[PDB]
Design a protein around this nucleic acid. Structure first.
Lengths: 80, 74, 109, 98, 93, 75
DNA sequence: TCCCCTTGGCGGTTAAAACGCGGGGGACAGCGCGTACGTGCGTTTAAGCGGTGCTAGAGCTTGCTACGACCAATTGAGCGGCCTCGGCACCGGGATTCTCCA
DNA sequence: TGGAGAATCCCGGTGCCGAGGCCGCTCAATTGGTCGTAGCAAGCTCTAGCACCGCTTAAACGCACGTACGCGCTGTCCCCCGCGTTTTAACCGCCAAGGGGA
């Protein structure tokens, strides 16, 4: 399935432009995919504990927000 | 690593700006020094990574600035 | 029985001192909650709401917009040396980034 | 003969565009499949609210954008206009994250 | 029944910019901010109580939380407006 | 009254701290930069530790006040 | 038994990703110099340890009343639902800006 | 400096859709009373924090001197951009299922 390859080079390029990056080594695309997957694992793992410890099957935006705030990366906008 | 008596006078000097005539426990001074030693030792390491990046052997204030900016202190 | 006067009205606050009292109790922050703690806290919440909303209302006007968009909140927060300290590890949905190009990257003259 | 801008001209135009815009830069449906692909390892027949995946794009795009800025500083510290994987590795390692 | 500060944020809005509006998406960020700073102050006031072995969240513990939590000139004006509100509360009734 | 005590972290003390961090060579510009870094850090921990000391209505700053102040800087 | 809502499939169509290719300019290796920093030695300066004296203030006990928890009665502030118009975006094409080769 | 052409700004028109305001209700904040208690105030102890003195030596520092490492300068090439062409799959709509919960 390997949907991490669905994070295409242009999408990683646009993220780098918003990051103010002028020139990008072609080796960056596979390092950025590896970074993203390592990050997105940790959040979904912890959110799923909130979902199941609340005896739900649906993971909810506040499960993500609690996981994010637990990981020190507080996100505003989706809920208080 | 740092000597005790000069660090003691340093923390008392700083305290004057927050409250005059504060007392400090002997244990409170050491808990501050050991935290400062651990802060600086653990920062110089992040500057050495900035100096060993860019092919240098010698750390520069530019490395402290990059370390502190990426640690998030800047 | 006298007509009720909301605890916010007596403090002059827009923020709800009664709700802030409940939430300090419901949250089990401590066994007891003095009558003044909801008044002091609600005043600080109302202040910090007013600070951010003036800077974001400026940013909105600077962009000819009447409504505060999330963009205007992020611009206001990141342009302020103290809101960016308070919210330095906070992420804002559709906030974006500050326009900021490193000068070494600009085209050479 | 048609025009052609110099190398680095359109990079600056793209920076000035994407630092001005706020809309999300990763495609929607490819990220849903990435989230559900990851979720499969943790529990079968999990569901996500649409807001739960959209909350999760916003968190990770901000993570990647915020990392690129730190790696760009590591690139220009090596006196390079070009970011390279060891810049990502340095940035994360200074962040205590690698 | 889900509770949101949006009604109070909007009253504060008309006292800083009577002409200016807000989007519900921006309001969601404001409501997230109010909840996050309530939680941070209340959590530190809770710790201040516990550290001092006191059963009561007092205004002195909101004040010290605000001095611990907020930076610089935000802390000093926040302490001012809180002490004014507590004074008006005590004086009024 | 105390003044100029930031010079009391001597240059060799900075070297000892730097070599413990693995640094092989130290620009002379590091010394003043490190003193600025030390003082900006130490001010923040002292400020909160004094804010805890005032809350207890104490005149003595205690090791537990340091611990709480450090724990907050940890955040 | 019945409603709600999340996942999957179908189709188009269309815009964004993938692929190609020339070239340029930036990465990067090689080289020279000079200066800037580590090492060594004599000097001094003050840190650290052993000893003396005092008093502030942490920390504990005791006593009582203030004040907040509790709860029953009352109501109005604030939320869920509905409605509309005006702010803002997207569209188009004319005007100004900016870049790059001459 | 010029200039053309491609890129961006502004200005006007159109739409739509979401914000701001209105109305019903409720349930959640406020009022008035009671009772326990907790923390606020007093008073005693004695602890350990601060000041000082004097000796010791080991750490600091000023300067001498070299060489090792920083940095500018030169060459190369390669490899990443930028723009044209091809392809795919992303996104929107609409329907389906069944799956869970009451």
């Amino acid at each position: 399935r390997d949907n991490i390859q669905g994070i295409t080079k242009p999408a990683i390029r646009r993220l780098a432009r918003r990051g103010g990056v002028k020139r990008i080594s072609g080796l960056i695309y596979e390092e950025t995919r590896g970074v993203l997957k390592v990050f997105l694992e940790n959040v979904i793992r912890d959110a799923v504990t909130y979902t199941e410890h609340a005896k739900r099957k649906t993971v909810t935006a506040m499960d993500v927000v609690y996981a994010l705030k637990r990981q020190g990366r507080t996100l505003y906008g989706f809920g208080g | 690593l740092i000597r005790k008596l000069p660090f003691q006078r340093l923390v008392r000097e700083i305290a004057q700006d927050f409250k005059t005539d504060l007392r400090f426990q002997s244990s409170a001074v050491m808990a501050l020094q050991e935290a400062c030693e651990a802060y600086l030792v653990g920062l110089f390491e992040d500057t050495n990574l900035c100096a060993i990046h860019a092919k240098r052997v010698t750390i520069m204030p530019k490395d402290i600035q990059l370390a502190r900016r990426i640690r998030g202190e800047r | 029985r006298a007509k009720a006067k909301s605890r916010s009205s007596r403090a002059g606050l827009q923020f709800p001192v009664g709700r802030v009292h409940r939430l300090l109790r419901k949250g089990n922050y401590a066994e007891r909650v003095g009558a003044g703690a909801p008044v002091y806290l609600a005043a600080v919440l109302e202040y910090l709401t007013a600070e951010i909303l003036e800077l974001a209302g400026n940013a909105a006007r600077d962009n000819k917009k009447t409504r505060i968009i999330p963009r205007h909140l992020q611009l206001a927060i990141r342009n302020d040396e103290e809101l960016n300290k308070l919210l330095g590890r906070v992420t804002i949905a559709q906030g974006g980034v500050l326009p900021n190009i490193q000068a070494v990257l600009l085209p050479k003259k | 003969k048609p025009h052609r801008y110099r190398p680095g001209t359109v990079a600056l135009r793209e920076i000035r565009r994407y630092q001005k815009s706020t809309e999300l830069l990763i495609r929607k449906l490819p990220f849903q499949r990435l989230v559900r692909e990851i979720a499969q390892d943790f529990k079968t027949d999990l569901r996500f609210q649409s807001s739960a995946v959209m909350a999760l794009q916003e968190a990770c795009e901000a993570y990647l954008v915020g990392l690129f800025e730190d790696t760009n500083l590591c690139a220009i510290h090596a006196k390079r206009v070009t970011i390279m994987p060891k810049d990502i590795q340095l940035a994360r390692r200074i962040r205590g994250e690698r | 029944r889900k509770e949101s500060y949006s009604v109070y944020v909007y009253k504060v809005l008309k006292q800083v910019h009577p002409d200016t509006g807000i989007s519900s998406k921006a309001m969601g960020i404001m409501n997230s901010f109010v909840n996050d700073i309530f939680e941070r102050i209340a959590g530190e006031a809770s710790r201040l109580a516990h550290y001092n072995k006191r059963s009561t969240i007092t205004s002195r513990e909101i004040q010290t939380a605000v001095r611990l939590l907020l930076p610089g000139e935000l802390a000093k004006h926040a302490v001012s407006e809180g002490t004014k509100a507590v004074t008006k509360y005590t004086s009024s009734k």
